[PDB]
Nucleic acid binder design. Structure first.
Length: 63
RNA sequence: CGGGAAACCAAAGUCUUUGGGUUCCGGGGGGAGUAUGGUUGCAAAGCUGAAACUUAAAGGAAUUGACGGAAGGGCACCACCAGGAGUGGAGCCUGCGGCUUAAUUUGACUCAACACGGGAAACCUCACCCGGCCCGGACACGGACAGGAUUGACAGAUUGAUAGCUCUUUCUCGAUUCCGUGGGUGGUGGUGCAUGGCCGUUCUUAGUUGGUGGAGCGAUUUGUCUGGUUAAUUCCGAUAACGAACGAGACUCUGGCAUGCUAACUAGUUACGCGACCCCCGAGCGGUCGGCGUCCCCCAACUUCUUAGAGGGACAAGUGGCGUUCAGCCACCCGAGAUUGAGCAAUAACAGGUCUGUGAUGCCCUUAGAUGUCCGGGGCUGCACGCGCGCUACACUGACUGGCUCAGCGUGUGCCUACCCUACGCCGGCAGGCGCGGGUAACCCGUUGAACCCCAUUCGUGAUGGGGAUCGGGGAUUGCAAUUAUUCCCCAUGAACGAGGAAUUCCCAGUAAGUGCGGGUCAUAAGCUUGCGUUGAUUAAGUCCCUGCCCUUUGUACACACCGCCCGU
């Protein structure tokens, strides 16, 4: 069992959508512009070099 | 008569209902019959004789226990005698302390610990030491709750691991998350000296209470005994006790044997029909005979063996001795001659073990840098040592090799869960492997065709081939992982040990003792333990000599009770 004081941390990588962050662009009515790669089926954009989803979980790794 | 604390007393009586006359003398215990003073004494010493201080009890009689190197009866191989096999001595496997280590986790200490916690731990179990995830933190009190919290997932460094642990941030369950206060659920964390329950032991002997009655003021006592008798406070008796309950015994299971009974293709059948099949396989030309490793349907005969239901049977009954001639004992034809072995088990207890079996639990510890849980690798097994249960031998009644033939309890597959028992054919020396055909079982394993033992060869008193430790190389198995070698096989090294000091345990009949086989632990499996069967004695029919036990009589300055108390430089 874990008996020792030194772990140096243990916490959650807290996530927020409370911040101001645009996922599409502010265009005229009837036309929406996508800043990053997002699918109709909606979060597949590059993280830093890979793609992964929450509702689909299809890992893109060479495109 | 009557006194007295009572043991006792014709005085220790005539004592609160006290007064016959008179002498000496004591006021809690110790310091003390000490110091000093007086006095007698040849000397030893005698007579008279304080206080300071210290202490809560000293002290008498009886009552129950405990105890006795105290007597009287009696029982027990956790006792001895007569013996047998053993331990201690040597190799080793497991438990203990000490040493050691991050940790080598802990309980247990004469029987009543030390092969015990089914404690044979690779992980797991793991409670120990080194690291890493999680909140399975109920609910409510306030916030965060609309650019709306908070899930989590490979980026790449990092970590040990491809734990988005983190760093880093991109995705969602979206108000079930998230932060402080309140309540800790949780815990193999501490106290078995707070407990429950369950066990062990005192204690495997025969002992234990109360109702009414009698005695003592009383604690207590009698009933529970003078005596004989039995395994037994089991009886007959005796009797200021009577009538009853517990323990014993009685009861349950087990072994015996019942040529009688209802029964059996999942048992025997086995006797038979010889309904067939086979070998001249032999006396036998041959049949009948002997055999079958065989083959049958039930329209054979049943139940001796196989199984298990009711039965049945043994009860000091028959006879003879011994006895207060009651309880009973000894011997003998009969036959299971009352006799197999256990289970069960009272009164009062122990600061006997267990909080490490439990959602059984009080209190304390702790609860997020967790004493909760999960994961990784280790450790519980480490070596100058001493210990306690055990297997192996030290050999010739033996070992190596071949033939030979016989057993009984059980056990065995899909369960909240992961693998059972194994015939039979081939491959492989073997350890093992591959198709496979049975079993949830009187069905196939398995007619369980086990071992020492029975009959032959080799070895030749020699550390020899007895012995099988240690070490190297190899070959397979179960598993997420075998290295500090899980097991098993093969070659090979071939040590300690020449029957074991002081001590000490177990046993009296299919018991000791030898050999083998099941169950348990068990994915891998026993040198351990719980059971089964086979081979089969010598030495006893007794005593208190030792360690101990029950009852009675006596003794005590003991009462957490001889592991007691207690005396002086």
């Amino acid at each position: 069992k874990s008996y020792t004081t030194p772990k140096k941390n243990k916490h959650k990588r807290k996530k927020v959508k409370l911040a101001v962050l645009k996922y599409y662009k502010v265009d005229e009515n009837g036309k929406i512009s996508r800043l990053r790669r997002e699918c109709p089926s909606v979060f597949m954009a590059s993280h830093f070099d890979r793609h992964y989803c929450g509702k689909c979980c299809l890992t893109y790794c060479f495109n």
